[PDB]
Each structure stands twice: as structure tokens, then as C-alpha cells.
Amino acid sequence: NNYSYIDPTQLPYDHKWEFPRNRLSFGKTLGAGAFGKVVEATAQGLIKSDAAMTVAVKMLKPSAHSTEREALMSELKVLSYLGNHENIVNLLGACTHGPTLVITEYCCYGDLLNFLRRKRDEFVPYDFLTLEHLLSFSYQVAKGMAFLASKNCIHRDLAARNILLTHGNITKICDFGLARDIKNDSNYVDNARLPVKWMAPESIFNSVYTFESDVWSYGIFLWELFSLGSSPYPGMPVDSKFYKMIKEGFRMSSPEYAPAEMYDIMKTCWDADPDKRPTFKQIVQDIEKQISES
Ligand SMILES: COC(=O)N[C@@](C)(c1ccc(F)cc1)c1cnc(N2CCN(c3ncnn4cc(-c5cnn(C)c5)cc34)CC2)nc1
């Protein structure tokens, strides 16, 4: 035991992140749920001493159990360990001296799923959404996930709803509440509500999460993207028949606007054998070549 994997959630909270609570002014709620809410806010003096900036602030309800408080702190420590990357919603600060507040970047265009549904009607393959945009988004998300995988981290809730868009058509992966550093055991074994239609079969049937199950979810994200924000497995409810069809190899067909090479990636992401799925590193190089040929 002279060498070990450093567990990022065991490391101390770095007080370089600490920011005064009184310098945040809370605005409109950006997301809400059982644990708490994410709210838009103006932070005075966060980056430059005399300037206010718009941030997103994640917070728990007062009623949350101390285990929920630990999970928010673990997320904070995971983001601190990961460091900065262009394609992830980056940590900006925290308030840990009343309730724990986690301050991240504010993405002005919101989640990609609603963005696609807004732009669906005016989409043209060739300020309109185009096929070039969709290729860039697929590429940027794969870069972000490749970065996560290189840090021995799995996200576990990859989907268009958890991809945010900000200035410059930059996509950022958000919501790291379920992310895990799996360096030690090569997978993660998880009773909350789960995103069944984005989950690999091994995650549904045996509660196993890996690099490869993140790649499955990325395939579903691609289908969301090139169908311009449609719900996956349309007209199929989550029931006994859904699980049986997935187990027996049923897969979604190519969305209307997906290039053949992109649906090829989707199919490999959805292989029943996790070993046969590609890595995010391989996906990035594939999409690179596709972009290079217009
Ligand atoms: C069981 O599930 C839970 O309880 N989870 C929640 C409720 C939770 C909350 C607190 C907590 F402690 C634990 C969990 C939760 C809720 N929401 C979110 N997301 C995180 C990323 N978001 C944004 N981040 C940065 N900028 N930004 C801009 C926009 C935007 C929208 N419209 N426009 C024009 C712009 C949106 C964002 C959106 C909300 N995450 C988690």
C-alpha cells in the first residue's frame, strides 16, 4: 500500500475558492428539484475587484440531510480536482463559512435540449442552426468527456439537458452531482430516480457504471442532437417491453439530419458488449476527420 490512487473527495477543500456570501445577489431560478436549486446571481468582485458578473449558484434546501451536504462538497472537490476545461461548466467559487453555495460559470443560452427545440423550426442543413453547428457540438462534448475520462472520472448523467451553451457557440458539460472518480476499481456500482433511456444495459440491469457506460449515453446524446431535440425512443414508455427490447438488441434508427458517419458512431456507442464501444479519445479523432472534410 505504498502507492495509492489519490481520491479527490478525500482532499481538503481549498479555501482559494472561498467567496463572501454577502457579495452575491440572487436572481431567477435556473433549476429546481428535490435536493435544492440552481439560481442565477450577480457576484460583486469575484474576478475583478470592482466588477460584477453573472454566475450560477447551486444550493441545498435547509431540510437536506448531512449526507446531501457531503455530496455537494464532494462535487465541489471533484470540480476543483478536474481543473479548467473549455467544454465543462467551470467552478468559480464557493461559500462554506450558512448553507453551502457552489458558484459556477453562467451559460447564457441555457441547456442544449431546449435550445434545439427552439431552433428546430428554422433549422437548415446547409442566426439559424445548421449542420455545421451540430457537428461542432458533437465534437465539443466528446472533447469534454475525453477530458473527464483522462482524469479517471465518469459523469453518469450525460444528456442534452446537461449540456449548456454560452457565448461563441461553446458547449459545456454541467451537473457533476453524480460524477465519480473510478480510478481504483475500473467501474462504479451504485435508489434515486434514474435516466433510464440514456443508460447502458449494464447500468440498468446490474447498476454498473464505467467509462463505457458514459460512451453509451453519449450515443444517446448524439441521437438527441441530430433529431433536433427529440425525446429518445419516441412513443416507447419505460416498462417491461422497453427493457426487453433493449436487452434483445433493439436500437434507435438514424435521425433525419444525422450524417452516416455520425450514426455509425451512435451504433458503436450502443454495442451490447462494452469492450466494443469506442473511447471518447477515439470519438474525438473520428469527428475531427469528419469536420476536416466539411
Ligand atoms: C435530484 O436532482 C436535483 O436535485 N438537482 C438539482 C435541483 C440540484 C440543485 C442543487 C443541489 F445542491 C443539488 C441538486 C439541480 C438543478 N439544476 C441543475 N442545473 C445545473 C446547470 N445549470 C446552469 N449552470 C450554469 N449556467 N446556467 C445557465 C442556465 C440557463 C437556463 N436558461 N437560460 C437562459 C440560461 C442554466 C445554467 C442549470 C440547472 N443542477 C442540479
Side-chain angles (χ1 to χ4, degrees), residues 32-33 35-38 56 58-60 105-108 110 164 174:
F35 295 149
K37 65 199 178 203
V38 180
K58 180 168 179 168
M59 68 189 69
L60 291 176
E105 291 165 352
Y106 176 78
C107 300
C108 56
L164 311 179
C174 76

Side-chain angles (χ1 to χ4, degrees), residues 71 145 148 153-159 161-162 173-182 187-196 198-200 203 207-215 217-218 280:
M145 293 301 303
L148 294 197
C153 292
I154 63 172
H155 184 282
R156 293 205 297 150
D157 199 3
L158 183 57
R161 68 183 166 271
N162 285 335
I173 300 158
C174 76
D175 196 349
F176 286 71
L178 299 182
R180 302 291 179 260
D181 186 301
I182 69 148
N187 69 37
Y188 180 78
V189 174
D190 197 48
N191 281 244
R193 302 191 313 134
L194 297 159
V196 169
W198 285 259
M199 289 168 63
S203 308
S207 302
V208 161
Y209 296 84
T210 67
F211 296 131
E212 293 81 15
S213 66
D214 265 7
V215 167
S217 302
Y218 177 81
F280 283 115

Side-chain angles (χ1 to χ4, degrees), residues 67 69-120 122-126 128-131 133-182 187-272:
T67 37
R69 328 199 178 192
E70 298 161 15
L72 181 66
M73 288 297 303
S74 289
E75 170 173 4
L76 172 58
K77 294 181 177 182
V78 164
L79 294 171
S80 176
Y81 150 85
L82 288 176
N84 215 283
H85 192 284
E86 178 164 69
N87 297 128
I88 78 185
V89 169
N90 288 291
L91 171 71
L92 294 181
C95 309
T96 70
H97 188 52
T100 305
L101 308 180
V102 178
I103 308 168
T104 70
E105 291 165 352
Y106 176 78
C107 300
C108 56
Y109 296 130
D111 71 279
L112 201 53
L113 181 67
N114 278 291
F115 173 75
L116 294 170
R117 291 177 172 170
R118 286 203 306 276
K119 313 286 272 208
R120 168 187 303 180
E122 291 280 75
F123 171 83
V124 302
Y126 292 84
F128 292 160
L129 191 57
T130 78
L131 188 51
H133 295 15
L134 303 189
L135 270 299
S136 175
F137 296 164
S138 76
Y139 176 60
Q140 296 178 50
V141 174
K143 289 191 290 185
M145 293 301 303
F147 173 67
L148 294 197
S150 80
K151 295 281 198 161
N152 276 344
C153 292
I154 63 172
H155 184 282
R156 293 205 297 150
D157 199 3
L158 183 57
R161 68 183 166 271
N162 285 335
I163 305 297
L164 311 179
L165 189 72
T166 183
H167 294 113
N169 275 327
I170 310 287
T171 60
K172 292 168 167 298
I173 300 158
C174 76
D175 196 349
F176 286 71
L178 299 182
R180 302 291 179 260
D181 186 301
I182 69 148
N187 69 37
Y188 180 78
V189 174
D190 197 48
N191 281 244
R193 302 191 313 134
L194 297 159
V196 169
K197 285 189 170 180
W198 285 259
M199 289 168 63
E202 67 267 15
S203 308
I204 301 172
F205 302 143
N206 292 132
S207 302
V208 161
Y209 296 84
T210 67
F211 296 131
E212 293 81 15
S213 66
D214 265 7
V215 167
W216 179 288
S217 302
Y218 177 81
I220 308 290
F221 162 74
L222 291 188
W223 191 94
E224 294 186 88
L225 189 54
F226 289 99
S227 73
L228 305 179
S230 293
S231 282
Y233 307 97
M236 303 182 55
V238 173
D239 57 8
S240 302
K241 182 159 160 52
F242 174 83
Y243 297 123
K244 181 168 158 73
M245 295 178 61
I246 292 298
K247 185 187 181 188
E248 293 177 355
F250 176 87
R251 304 292 183 259
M252 288 184 288
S253 48
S254 180
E256 174 182 10
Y257 297 116
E261 301 74 27
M262 292 301 305
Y263 184 63
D264 277 350
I265 295 177
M266 304 189 201
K267 288 198 265 56
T268 65
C269 291
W270 299 334
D271 198 295

